Amino acid sequence: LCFGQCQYTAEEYQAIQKALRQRLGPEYISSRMAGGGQKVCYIEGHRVINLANEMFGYNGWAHSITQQNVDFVDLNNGKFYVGVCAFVRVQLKDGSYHEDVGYGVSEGLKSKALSLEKARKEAVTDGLKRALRSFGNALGNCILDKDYLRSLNKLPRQLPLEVDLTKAKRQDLEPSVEEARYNSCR
Amino acid sequence: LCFGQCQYTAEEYQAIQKALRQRLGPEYISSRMAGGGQKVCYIEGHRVINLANEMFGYNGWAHSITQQNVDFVDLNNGKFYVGVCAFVRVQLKDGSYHEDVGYGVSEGLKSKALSLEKARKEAVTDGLKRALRSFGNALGNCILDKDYLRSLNKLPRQLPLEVDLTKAKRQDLEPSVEEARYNSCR
Amino acid sequence: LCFGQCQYTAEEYQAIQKALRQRLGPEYISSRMAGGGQKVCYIEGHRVINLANEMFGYNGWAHSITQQNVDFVDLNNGKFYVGVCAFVRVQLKDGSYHEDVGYGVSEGLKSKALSLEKARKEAVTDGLKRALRSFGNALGNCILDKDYLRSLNKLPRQLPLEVDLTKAKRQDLEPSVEEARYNSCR
Amino acid sequence: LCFGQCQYTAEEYQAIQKALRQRLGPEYISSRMAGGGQKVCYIEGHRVINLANEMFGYNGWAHSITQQNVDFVDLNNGKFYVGVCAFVRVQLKDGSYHEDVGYGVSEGLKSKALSLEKARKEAVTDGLKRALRSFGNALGNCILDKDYLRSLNKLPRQLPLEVDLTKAKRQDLEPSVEEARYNSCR
Amino acid sequence: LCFGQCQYTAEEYQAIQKALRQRLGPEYISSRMAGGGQKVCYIEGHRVINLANEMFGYNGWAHSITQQNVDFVDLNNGKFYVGVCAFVRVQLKDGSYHEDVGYGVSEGLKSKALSLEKARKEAVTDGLKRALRSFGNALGNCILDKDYLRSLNKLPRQLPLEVDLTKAKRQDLEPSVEEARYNSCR
Amino acid sequence: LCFGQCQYTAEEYQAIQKALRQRLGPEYISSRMAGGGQKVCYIEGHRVINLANEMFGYNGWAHSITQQNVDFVDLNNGKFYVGVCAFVRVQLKDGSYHEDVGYGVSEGLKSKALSLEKARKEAVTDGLKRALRSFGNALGNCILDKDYLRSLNKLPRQLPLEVDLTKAKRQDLEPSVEEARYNSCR
Amino acid sequence: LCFGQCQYTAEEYQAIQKALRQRLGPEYISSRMAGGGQKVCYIEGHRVINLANEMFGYNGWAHSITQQNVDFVDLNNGKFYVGVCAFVRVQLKDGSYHEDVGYGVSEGLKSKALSLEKARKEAVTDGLKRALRSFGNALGNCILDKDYLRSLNKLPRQLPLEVDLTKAKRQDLEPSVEEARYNSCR
Amino acid sequence: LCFGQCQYTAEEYQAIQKALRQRLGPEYISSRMAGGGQKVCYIEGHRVINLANEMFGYNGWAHSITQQNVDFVDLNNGKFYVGVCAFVRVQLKDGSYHEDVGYGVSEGLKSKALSLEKARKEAVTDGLKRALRSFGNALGNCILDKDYLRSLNKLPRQLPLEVDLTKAKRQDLEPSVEEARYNSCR
Amino acid sequence: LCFGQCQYTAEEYQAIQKALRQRLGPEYISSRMAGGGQKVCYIEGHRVINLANEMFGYNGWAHSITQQNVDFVDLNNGKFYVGVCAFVRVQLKDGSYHEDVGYGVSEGLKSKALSLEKARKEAVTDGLKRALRSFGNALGNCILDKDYLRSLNKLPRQLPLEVDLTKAKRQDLEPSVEEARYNSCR
Amino acid sequence: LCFGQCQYTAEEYQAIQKALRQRLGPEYISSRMAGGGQKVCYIEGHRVINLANEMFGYNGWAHSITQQNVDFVDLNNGKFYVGVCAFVRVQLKDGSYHEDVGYGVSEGLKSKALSLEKARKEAVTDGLKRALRSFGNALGNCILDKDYLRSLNKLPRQLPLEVDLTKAKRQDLEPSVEEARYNSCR
Amino acid sequence: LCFGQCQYTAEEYQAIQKALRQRLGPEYISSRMAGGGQKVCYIEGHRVINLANEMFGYNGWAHSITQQNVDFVDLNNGKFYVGVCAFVRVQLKDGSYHEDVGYGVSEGLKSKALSLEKARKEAVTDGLKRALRSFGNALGNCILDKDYLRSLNKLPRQLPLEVDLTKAKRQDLEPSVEEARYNSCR
């Protein structure tokens, strides 16, 4: 009854089906400037990872890199141009799964190492994000829907939120977790 | 009783068989201009993803990339011409499946990276969409039926639909979900 | 008791054996002009897909591409000549199966990308259609029977039959399916 | 108890052993002119497929292409000469099987694509037909028996038979089948 | 209890052990002229196939091509010289088996295609026949026994029997089989 | 309890152990002239096959070609010199087995095809014979024993026995077997 | 019930889901100067290792290197420039898992060996750290969240921590451990 | 309870353990002249085979050629020099086993084919003999023991025992074998 | 219930979780001079090995070399420069595991053999040590923590303590062991 | 309960443990002259084989050649220099095992074939001996112990013992053996 | 319950854990002169083998060569320089295991064969010793501990004790071993 062999209970299946339908608020979306001097919306990897963890549980989803391929490493002046693709397969405790390609780009740096590093890492993250979109709007599928983007723009400018470090983990030991783990062995 | 080993109950099977027969409304179909100065109808990936999730459940269908091949990367001026194909296999919790090819194209950009990226991604999405058509009209099989297209044109315009974020997910935490999941490990 | 492991019940077996014998009416057959200035009859992919879904159930048949091979890509003027083959294996929930080759051709376009895309996609569809013919007339085995073709010509033409979009699907939500699904978790 | 794991019941076994012994009437045999200006008898693929379906049931036999190899593609004027072989393995629900080679030829066309297409497709159908012969006369084993051919000639003009499409399938929906199917999940 | 897993009952085993010992009559043997202007006796493939089907049942034996290799394709004038070998494995429902080589030859034709076609097909049939010999005289093992050949010559000639086509099959349907089948899904 | 999984009963084991010890009479041995102008004794393949079938039952032994390799094809005048080896594995219903090499030679023919054919076939038969020798004298192990050969020579010649084609098979149909097989389905 | 086959009890699952949400205090975060003269925050591998051990138990998580590839080793003066990537898969006792790429860089050393050593080691640790981030904020996912970084800066520098070696392990022997062990082979 | 899965009964184990200890008499040993003009003793393959069959039963030992490699084929005048090695693995019904190398040599013949044939066959037989030696003196292990050879020489010359072909096999049939084996199906 | 399939008992798990947290005393730490004229602390392999044996039991942990690769062997004067890496995977009886890279270096020796030997052996040990660190401070995870190193320096330099060889194993025989082992077969 | 799956009984285990400790007497050790004009002690393969058979039973130990590699074949005058290595794995009925390398050398012969043959065969035997040494002194582990060699020299002349061929093997047949066998079939 | 599947009983486990902690006396350690004119201590392979056999039982540990690679064979004068590495994996009846590299060196000999032989054999033994060290001091882990070495030197010489060959084995047969072996099959 380990990962890949669970079957969702009607209650968890139903809760998730509904939750996945939600589109995400402005607090999730960020943007950058495309070469064409045009806005590009996207969700940052860390937000997607937390959405996934909260949607399926830290132990309810997984991902692996089926393959990563460096498309090219070009030196055209004193600078490097690098294109990398990754194929990421994400899976639920269910055994259900989705796979997609992510692409990573680095153009202009003078460091070969730094260029490769950027491109390889972004390809994986980009792939993880695209694979996860398959589960629904709440995991990013709304993101490329022009009507969603449009109605997002008609929303209030929004101030970045302050993070409250008051209750941040401040040491390794996890008392409650240790308690549970010791009772589990029984 | 995990993914790939379910067997549809008579009730779910019957409901789905019927639902799949439906053709989709104008709110799903979009179009672009082909090189021959001719309209081409298609369904955006995100719509197909949601159609699938609602038809089979977020844990009812899955897809993998059996293979992706870059056919060519030509530089014919200062611009790149790229053709990529992807073979996508989609499967139901049932074990039933359909596989098809998708193609991705990028012609005219000056960025090799941006060209490869566009082509690889679209090939995958295109392949996922074609594989899914095999299940029925509701998943896209009507889309290339000239009589369906014809009768779609005999409809009033279609204006951009408005998305309402009044109840957009703004926090990660899904209480209902956590409850259902908490009640499942016992 | 998943896909590939079912055994047909005598009742379903018998109904299908019979239904498969039927030849198809004019409403399925379409035609194009061969190079030799000669009529060529065929069934469009989407019709075959629906025939299959109705004959076996959306979860009663499946298909995969065992292999797709690009035979050649020739540039003989400013135009491309492309030949592609696909091997498609279709299978029933039974485990029974048939495999065939399909071919895809593109001659004359100036776009390499567009040529490759056309040829790869048609090879697959063509192969799917040929593999499916093996199950019987109702799935297209009649199509190449000259006596059938002959007696088809001796029938009244058949103007494009309009499509009834009043009952079209316009939202992703499928309430009946959603209910039956909940009752299946049980 | 799926395909490949059935065992024939004494009754079905016996009926088939007998039925397979029959030689086929003139209505099955067709002929063409060999290069040596000599008659060559053969059965059209579509007839063989129907013989097979009726003999074993749509779910009683299967076939796959173990391999297809293009022997050569020669351009000797402005025309193409192509030879292709296919190895086809046909199997019964029994697990019993037979495998043979089929060959496909195209000589004289100016289209490479059309030539490859013709040769690859015929190789498969030819292989399928030869593999099937192994089961008995009723599936084509008589066809190359000179004494059978001889006594076939000593018969009238097997004058073109008519194909009656009164009862031709005009829709996708199969009511008797749907009923049978929906009850199979009980 | 499918193919490859049956065990012969004492009764069937014994009947077959005996039947296999028989040498075959003149009605099976045919001959051709070897290059050395010398008679060569052999059994035609179709006879061997029927011997096998009657000896073991249409579902009691099977064969596969473990491999086919084209040894050479020589053009020495305007004619082709082709040598092809095939390894054929035949098996009983028992699991018992025998494998042998078959060879195919085509010397003198001007068609490469026709030469390859002839050699490949004959290699397979030749291999199937040699493999089958291993089971006994009744399946051809006598054929190369000079004392058998000698005493065959000391026999009156025979007029190739006329095939009684009165009862020839002229229809696909086999109501006999179709019922034996129906009462097996039960 | 299929081939490869039987265990010999004490009775059969004992009978065979004893029978295998027998040396074979003059009626089995034949000879040819070695290049050194010296007699070479050997058993003809068809005799060995029958010895095997009678010793173990048609379903009691089997053999496969683990590998066949063409050592060389030399043209040294207008003639061909060919050496071929085959590795043959023979097995009993027991699971017990023996494997050996067989060699095939063809020197002097002007036909490449005929040379290859001869060498390939003889390598296999030769290998099958050498493998079978391992089971005992009755299967050929005596054949290379100089003391056995010597005492074979000290015998009066013996005229070719005649093949009693009285009761030779003149039909396929074998009611005997067919009748038992019909009761071996219950 | 070994590693990879456990299933989290509801109590441990819940405790860990909660614990993983925590962001980490200043005591975890360290920083270095990027080439762009800009601060880069990160967590040291040894802290991440302890975080993981305390969160899941020393036997609750694992990691393997699916692959490590040296991208390049360039000598551009008397100095080496090295880029290495590692794919690290971490897994819980659950069977759940996440995989990511890590990169290792060495620029400027004159020792090839020292350069390779630094890059291969950092690539692995970097990858382990990135893979672990997928489980939640508590394992590092907060680290790249600009709002978290921002609110981390609005805190007083912290003086260096003194470690207390008072109770440091001074012998290899672990008595309490040896007991427990010994009472388990029962 | 087939080959490879038997376990020796205490009685058979004991009998064989003892029997294997015996050194073999002069009637087994033969010799030839080494190049160094020195005697070389050896046992002929056929004797070893019979020793094995009598020691373990025809179904008590087996052997296979794990690999055969032709080391070289040199033509140094008009003659051929060939060296071949074979790896032979022999096994008991027990599952126990021993494997060794055998070498085959042919120096001086003018026939390439005859040279290869001699070397390949001897390598196998030589290997089989060396592998069998591992079981004990009775199977050849004494053969290279100088003290055994020495005391063998101190024996009377010996006339090669006469081969009594009285009861020699003249029939394929084996009524007691066919008897037992007919009852084993019961 | 062999290695890789145990499950820690709550008692052993708990003891180890705790023991692993300890940092190690000065008696474990040693140092060398880095090229930059800077101190480098490390733990000697043998200490690590004993820490592991005592922490998990001689039969509680294991390690294997997944791969070892020689990066380069350079001769730049009369001296050799060698870089080698090893990937070591350590596992607990649990099935839990951790893998890391180790590196081995040899710069300056004149012996190629001695250089390779040093580099290959250190790579393995280095890897084994790094993999083991993943389990906790007690196994080395503290070692690279600057605050730990710092507070280690503030200790009274430690005097290289003596080894008491009095009770040193002087023979191979192991009494209590041989007894305990003898009984385990009961 | 076949080879590789037995478990030693306490009694057999204990007897063997003790027996293995014995060093072997002068009757086992032989010697040759090393190139350095120095004595080299060793045990002859046939003695080792018998030691093994008596220690574990003819069915208690096994060995296979995991690999044999020819290091070189040099011709430096008119003579050949050959080095060959073999990896031999020996196993007990237990499943326990040891593997080692053996080396084979042939320097000076003028025959390539004879050189290869000597080196290949010795490598195997040498490997078998080294592998077996791992089990204990009784199987050869003492042989390289200088203190054992030294105290062996202080023992008198080892006049070759006499092999009393009295009750040697004269026939193939083995009655007692054959009797247990007919009784083990029960 | 064969090798690799035993579980140590608490009693054997405990005895071994304790025995493994012992450092070894002077009677185990030997030394040689390193090129740097410096003493190098080590244990001879045969001592290690016996230590192992006595610690775990002849059937309690095993080892295999996962791989052996020859790094180089250099000829720099008339002498050979050879470096060889071996990867040895040792395992307990437990399933627990440890793997390490061993290196073999040969510098200066004029015989290529003798050089390769020395390096390959030492690499294996060296690897076996290093692998074994992982189990504890008693198997060699102390050997490289400078404080142990130091306190070993502070001892008295020790005359290489005399080996007492009184009860040295002179026969093969082992009566008790053999008695137990006859009683086990029961």
From Swiss-Prot, chains A, B, C, D, E, F, G, H, I, J, K:
UniProt-recorded Gene Ontology molecular function terms: DNA binding; identical protein binding; single-stranded DNA binding
Q: List-wise, which residues carry Phosphotyrosine?
A: Y81
Task: Give the sites modified to Phosphoserine.
Answer: S176
The answer to whether UniProt assigns keyword Electron transport to this entry is no
- Top-level taxon: Eukaryota
DNA-binding region(s): which residue ranges? 129-133
Q: How is it modified after translation?
A: Phosphorylated upon DNA damage by ABL1, and probably by ATM or ATR.
Query: What quaternary arrangement does the UniProt entry report?
Result: The full-length protein forms heptameric rings. Interacts with ABL1. Interacts with RPA2; the interaction is direct and associates RAD52 with the RPA complex. Interacts with RAD51AP1.
**Record localization:** Nucleus
What is the organism lineage in this UniProt record? Eukaryota, Metazoa, Chordata, Craniata, Vertebrata
Principal place of residence: nucleus
Q: Which family does it belong to?
A: Belongs to the RAD52 family.
**Per the record, what is the consequence of mutating R32A?**
Abolishes ssDNA-binding
- Relate the outcome reported for changing K129A: Abolishes ssDNA-binding
Recite the UniProt keywords alphabetically. Answer: DNA damage, DNA recombination, DNA repair, DNA-binding, Nucleus, Phosphoprotein
GO annotations of cellular component type? nucleoplasm; nucleus; protein-containing complex; protein-DNA complex
Name under which the protein is recorded: DNA repair protein RAD52 homolog
Gene Ontology terms describing biological process: cellular response to oxidative stress; DNA double-strand break processing involved in repair via single-strand annealing; DNA recombinase assembly; DNA recombination; double-strand break repair; double-strand break repair via homologous recombination; double-strand break repair via single-strand annealing; mitotic recombination
Which part of the complete protein is shown? 24 to 209 of 418
Organism, as annotated: Homo sapiens (Human)
Outcome of swapping R130A = Moderately defective in both ss and dsDNA-binding
What does the UniProt function comment say about this protein? Involved in double-stranded break repair. Plays a central role in genetic recombination and DNA repair by promoting the annealing of complementary single-stranded DNA and by stimulation of the RAD51 recombinase.
